[PDB]
Amino acid sequence: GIDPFTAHATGAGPAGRYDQATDTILTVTENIFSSMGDAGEMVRQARILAQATSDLVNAIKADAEGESDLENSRKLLSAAKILADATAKMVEAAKGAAAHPDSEEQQQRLREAAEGLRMATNAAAQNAIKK
């Protein structure tokens, strides 16, 4: 219905491979820093990150096996492993920083864990197999 297919340009192909899921994670991550102060809502956001990461971890594995390269496949499998742990550390820190709101170390570990998760996810986003 009014398609950009060979119309104004050569189609309109967006995203990459993990873009929909990474977009969620990259965005929701910021929400933990935004919700910072509300324990229930903070942990809520972390649960979303875990959920979203779970999608990627399983996806990246299968997508890696679809690649016709050993090293790149190993990298993808590694990226998923890095991600899934960045999330695990993040989520655990978010729980503590939320339920223990004023606690300094809980906040500090969250800052680093969340940014680490942000890094891992944003990296997985970039390495996503397209084409």
Swiss-Prot record:
Region annotated Helical bundle R3, chain positions: 7-131
Effect ascribed to mutating T53V: Reduces stability and binding to VCL with little effect on binding to APBB1IP
Protein's cellular compartments: Cell projection, Ruffle membrane; Cytoplasm, Cytoskeleton; Cell surface; Cell junction, Focal adhesion
Subunit structure: Part of a complex composed of THSD1, PTK2/FAK1, TLN1 and VCL. Interacts with THSD1; this promotes interaction with PTK2/FAK1 and VCL. Interacts with NRAP and LAYN. Interacts with SYNM. Interacts with ITGB1; the interaction is prevented by competitive binding of ITGB1BP1. Binds with high affinity to VCL and with low affinity to integrins. Interacts with APBB1IP; this inhibits VCL binding. Interacts with PTK2/FAK1. Interacts with PIP5K1C. Interacts with F-actin. Interacts with SVEP1.
Cited function: High molecular weight cytoskeletal protein concentrated at regions of cell-matrix and cell-cell contacts. Involved in connections of major cytoskeletal structures to the plasma membrane. With KANK1 co-organize the assembly of cortical microtubule stabilizing complexes (CMSCs) positioned to control microtubule-actin crosstalk at focal adhesions (FAs) rims.
Domain notes: Consists of an N-terminal FERM domain linked via a short unstructured region to a large flexible C-terminal rod which contains 13 amphipathic helical bundles (R1-R13). The rod begins with a five-helix bundle (R1) followed by three four-helix bundles (R2-R4). These are followed by a series of eight five-helix bundles (R5-R7 and R9-R13) in which the N- and C-termini are positioned at opposite ends of the bundle, creating a linear chain. The four-helix bundle R8 does not disrupt the chain because it is inserted into a loop in the R7 five-helix bundle.
Designated name of the protein: Talin-1
Species of provenance: Mus musculus (Mouse)
Organism classification: Eukaryota, Metazoa, Chordata, Craniata, Vertebrata
GN (gene name): Tln1
